[PDB]
Amino acid sequence: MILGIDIGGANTKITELHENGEFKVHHLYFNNDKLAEVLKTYSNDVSHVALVTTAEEGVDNILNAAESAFGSNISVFDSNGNFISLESAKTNNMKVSASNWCGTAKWVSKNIEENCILVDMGSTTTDIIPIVEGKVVAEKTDLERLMNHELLYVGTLRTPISHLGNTISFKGVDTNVSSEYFAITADISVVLEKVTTEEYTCDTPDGKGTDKRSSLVRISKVLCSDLDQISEIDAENIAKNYYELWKELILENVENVAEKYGSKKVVITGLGENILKDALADFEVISVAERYGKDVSLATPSFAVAELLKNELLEHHH
Amino acid sequence: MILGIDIGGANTKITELHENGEFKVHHLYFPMDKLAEVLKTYSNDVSHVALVTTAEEGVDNILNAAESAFGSNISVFDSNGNFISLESAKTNKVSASNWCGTAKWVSKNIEENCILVDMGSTTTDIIPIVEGKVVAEKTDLERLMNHELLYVGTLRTPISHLGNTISFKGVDTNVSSEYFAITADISVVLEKVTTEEYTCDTPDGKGTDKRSSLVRISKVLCSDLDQISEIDAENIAKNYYELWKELILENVENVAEKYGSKKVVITGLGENILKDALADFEVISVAERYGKDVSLATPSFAVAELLKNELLEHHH
Ligand SMILES: [Ca+2]
């Protein structure tokens, strides 16, 4: 078996690649060694990728925990998109860190499409990186990606509503909105049924319920109102109009990156795949959730590196 | 000697209006009365204006907290624009805008046909005054729908609220949606307010100085001072300050066009930004005519004057 380990601190994902062809994606929340070792039975090679950040390096703990769980057969994914040894190479922290899109993009360029745009929308961000002739050609830093529209800050859950726009069409009139932290995209998604109530993973702006009504109450606060001054149907239209700005913002950013290299194909994945295929309907859409299943779509980084590792192996031999 | 009491929830402003016209503004803030008495001697009449709401009725909690420190010489300001007795407040209209009291004052002592523009730490009120009558909408909702309420302030406005893209090194650049920088960072960097005028907390709970603001701004573009220069981060502030002024001006133009108004009376913490953004109009600065202390506590000053003008009027 080949494992794809994606440790992101809050939630570490594991992809098991079996030789009979099937795979399994696992989710974990939270001693790390004893934990990882339970997934070590029958493992010959493991690709390790750190999706987390400098939050509270500690990269020494993950490497040591992974090494005592899987041995020396560990390949960590570089910050450049290359596999390097657990030994020395990565044991020297820096160079280990990786983005949420690098492995995924490299995996797409070699297994799904050589010329396209990878659009990965999580809960907070949307990565939009171009792939040309089998090569990932996005900028390296987030700053350079923001300047190149390869990084857009719109997610399915944690995006403040006014980030989408400081004015919105309300009752046929362009209406100014509050800047206070009252509602987020999670509220929009719940109200428009783009996500079930069980997917509202982040804390609510007010600390109240995640239900459809509570969301509408939070939305109402964007126009300094409440479910008394306005109806639930009016607050619902607020969310629908914002959903429109949401898709529109995604499209223009993707169109812009597409124009650079004439790419006409997009490959979508992540929490916001439903939203993505709605906003990018004009392009030829290749859905990861349709081709590999929803779980892979929600844990692409771990799956991508496991496949890259397994392909390099079969390639090394053959 | 008249007292203009302005209670805004947990923060209150008290104006001392002496006979000869001399005045002294007092800013009070404390966790909750007793200190209301430290200013009761040598005081006859007093006006009361509560420019705050509730947020988890609750009016008696203070009107009685004053009646015990000012007897019944208190004249509370209505939400309809007129003064009324404590009795009418106790039994009921007592709570109101941060702008009504001020507007009324402007339409009698400053100008009858204009637009009052009050930019505080968080909001900007744009209420039109026509023929001496404040003709702005009632609720906040209606005002947001009529460019009479703009949610941008001198201090606590999340930067991306001004625009989710910004011009950087000549390119349309996307920005982070995370709470990293607020308008207070812009004001301090462009010296539109003093370092000591940075009231609200800082996003990263750090210094309110120049550099500390540039550090937070850099984060709006997923960067820091090791990746971009201080001049660069400052250009980010300037460009955002532009979108800021543009946003204010557009809202003021929509209202001006509706009422043919040509004059603007600006007041509030962000007066320096207001007179800059509204340079095209005929600008009447409250801070330049009455001093900064008045532009920072206009509500309490207005009711102080209004009451006086009515007392010297009930004598006819
Ligand atoms: Ca480059």
Classify each residue of A60-71 as buried b or exposed e, where b means 16 or more C-beta atoms within 10 Å of its C-beta: eebbebbbebbe
β-pairing, B149-150 vs B124-130, is antiparallel
- Find the largest Cα–Cα distance for chain A: 70
Spatial CA neighbour of A176 closest among B96, B157, B280? B157
What tokens were used for B109?
Answer: 């002592």
CB atoms near residue B104 (< 10 Å) = 23
| Three-class SS state of B227 | coil
Query: Is the Cβ–Cβ distance between A47 and A309 less than 8 Å?
Result: yes
| Nearest-angstrom CA–CA distance, A144 and B174 | 10
Which residue bears the tokens 């339409």? B107
The reply to whether residue A179 touches residue B150, judged by beta carbons under 8 angstroms, is: no
What tokens were used for A78?
Answer: 């570089």
| Nearest-angstrom CA–CA distance, B237 and B187 | 9
Task: Provide Rg for chain A, Cα atoms.
Answer: 21
Cα distance from N-terminal residue to C-terminal residue, chain B = 20
| Nearest-angstrom CA–CA distance, A153 and A119 | 12
Q: Phi and psi for A211 in degrees, rounded to 5?
A: -55, 170
CB atoms near residue B226 (< 10 Å) = 7
| Rounded distance from Cα B235 to ligand 1 centre (Å) | 22
Return the residue in B151, B177, B178, B217 with the most chain A beta carbons within 10 A, the one to mutate for interface testing. B177
Spatial CA neighbour of B104 closest among B286, B299, B308, B313? B299
What tokens were used for B144?
Answer: 């947001």
Return the residue in B161, B182, B236, B244 with the most chain A beta carbons within 10 A, the one to mutate for interface testing. B161
Q: Phi and psi for A266 in degrees, rounded to 5?
A: -125, 145
Q: CA angle A203-A205-A211, nearest 5°? A: 75
Query: Is the Cβ–Cβ distance between A244 and A95 less than 8 Å?
Result: no
| Nearest-angstrom CA–CA distance, B87 and B93 | 12
| Nearest-angstrom CA–CA distance, B2 and B14 | 10
CA dist A188 to A173, A196, A223, Å? 20, 11, 15
Q: Which residues pair with B221 in a beta bridge?
A: none
Contact residues on chain B for A165, CB-CB shorter than 8 A: 164
Task: Provide Rg for chain B, Cα atoms.
Answer: 21
Contact residues on chain A for B177, CB-CB shorter than 8 A: 124, 153-154, 158-160, 163
What tokens were used for B20?
Answer: 């000869």
| Nearest-angstrom CA–CA distance, A200 and A49 | 26
CA dist B98 to A27, B7, B117, B140, Å? 51, 10, 11, 11
Alpha helices in A94-182 (DSSP H): 102-111, 142-147, 161-164
What tokens were used for A116?
Answer: 């396209």
| Three-class SS state of A200 | coil
Which residues have a Cβ under 8 Å from the Cβ of A175 and sit 6 or more positions away? A167, A168, A169, A223, B144, B145
Q: Name all domains of chain B by residue range, CATH numbers in brackets.
A: 2-96 (3.30.420.40), 97-316 (3.30.420.190)
Q: Which residues pair with B125 in a beta bridge?
A: B118, B149
Query: Is the Cβ–Cβ distance between B163 and A179 less than 8 Å?
Result: no
What tokens were used for B37?
Answer: 């008495």
| Three-class SS state of A14 | strand
Cα distance from N-terminal residue to C-terminal residue, chain A = 18
| A84, HSE (Cβ side, Cα atoms, 13 Å) | 20
CB atoms near residue B202 (< 10 Å) = 18
CB atoms near residue A302 (< 10 Å) = 30
**Orientation of helix B230-259 relative to helix B210-219, angle to 10°:** 80
Q: Phi and psi for A43 in degrees, rounded to 5?
A: -105, 125
Amino acid symbol at A76:
V
Classify each residue of B37-67 as buried b or exposed e, where b means 16 or more C-beta atoms within 10 Å of its C-beta: eebeeeeebbbbbbbbeeeeeebeebbeebb
Query: Is the Cβ–Cβ distance between A29 and A10 less than 8 Å?
Result: yes
Query: Is the Cβ–Cβ distance between A299 and A288 less than 8 Å?
Result: no
Discontinuities after residues in chain A (C–N over 2.5 A): 30, 56
Query: Is the Cβ–Cβ distance between B121 and B154 less than 8 Å?
Result: yes
| Nearest-angstrom CA–CA distance, B284 and B53 | 29
Length reported for chain B: 316
CA dist B87 to B14, B57, B75, B307, Å? 22, 15, 10, 17
| Nearest-angstrom CA–CA distance, B276 and A214 | 41
The approach used to solve this structure was: X-ray
Which residues have a Cβ under 8 Å from the Cβ of A226 and sit 6 or more positions away? A217, A220
Which residues have a Cβ under 8 Å from the Cβ of A23 and sit 6 or more positions away? A15, A16, A17, A296, A303, A306
| Nearest-angstrom CA–CA distance, A96 and A259 | 32
| B279, HSE (Cβ side, Cα atoms, 13 Å) | 6
Which residues have a Cβ under 8 Å from the Cβ of A281 and sit 6 or more positions away? none
Which own/partner pairs from A135-143 qualify as long-range (CB within 8 Å, at least 24 positions apart)?
A135/A109, A136/A81, A136/A102, A136/A105, A136/A106, A136/A109, A137/A261, A138/A101, A138/A105, A141/B222, A141/B223, A141/B227, A142/B222, A142/B223, A143/B221, A143/B222, A143/B223, A143/B227, A143/B228
Q: Phi and psi for B30 in degrees, rounded to 5?
A: -170, 160
| Rounded distance from Cα A279 to ligand 1 centre (Å) | 28
DSSP category for residue A79: T
Which own/partner pairs from A17-23 qualify as long-range (CB within 8 Å, at least 24 positions apart)?
A17/A306, A17/A307, A17/A310, A23/A296, A23/A303, A23/A306
The reply to whether residue A225 touches residue B152, judged by beta carbons under 8 angstroms, is: no
| A312, HSE (Cβ side, Cα atoms, 13 Å) | 17
**Orientation of helix A232-261 relative to helix A212-220, angle to 10°:** 80
| Nearest-angstrom CA–CA distance, A262 and A272 | 24
H or E segment and range at residue A308: helix A300-316
DSSP category for residue B137: -
Alpha helices in B110-174 (DSSP H): 140-144
Interface membership of B174 toward A (CB under 8 Å)? yes
| Nearest-angstrom CA–CA distance, A97 and A48 | 10
CB atoms near residue B25 (< 10 Å) = 23
| Nearest-angstrom CA–CA distance, B16 and B72 | 18
β-pairing, B2-8 vs B11-17, is antiparallel
Q: Phi and psi for A136 in degrees, rounded to 5?
A: -85, 120
What tokens were used for A275?
Answer: 């939203």
Amino acid symbol at B75:
S
Spatial CA neighbour of A272 closest among A127, A146, A155? A155
Window 68-87 of B, Cβ < 8 Å to A: none
Length reported for chain A: 318
Interface membership of A175 toward B (CB under 8 Å)? yes
* A55 backbone φψ class: left, alpha, beta (φ>0; ψ -120 to 50): beta
| Three-class SS state of B128 | strand
CB atoms near residue A79 (< 10 Å) = 16
Which residues have a Cβ under 8 Å from the Cβ of A305 and sit 6 or more positions away? A4, A5, A6, A47, A48, A49, A77, A103, A107
| Nearest-angstrom CA–CA distance, A120 and A117 | 10
What tokens were used for A105?
Answer: 């993009």
Contact residues on chain A for B251, CB-CB shorter than 8 A: 176
CB atoms near residue B142 (< 10 Å) = 16
Window 223-242 of B, Cβ < 8 Å to A: 223, 227-228
Query: Is the Cβ–Cβ distance between B19 and B38 less than 8 Å?
Result: no
Alpha helices in chain B (DSSP H): 60-70, 86-91, 100-109, 140-144, 183-189, 210-219, 230-259, 271-277, 286-290, 292-295, 298-311
CA dist A82 to A49, A85, A137, A161, B107, Å? 11, 10, 15, 38, 71
Which own/partner pairs from B76-84 qualify as long-range (CB within 8 Å, at least 24 positions apart)?
B76/B47, B76/B48, B76/B49, B77/B47, B77/B48, B77/B49, B77/B101, B77/B303, B77/B306, B81/B134, B83/B47, B83/B306, B83/B307, B83/B310
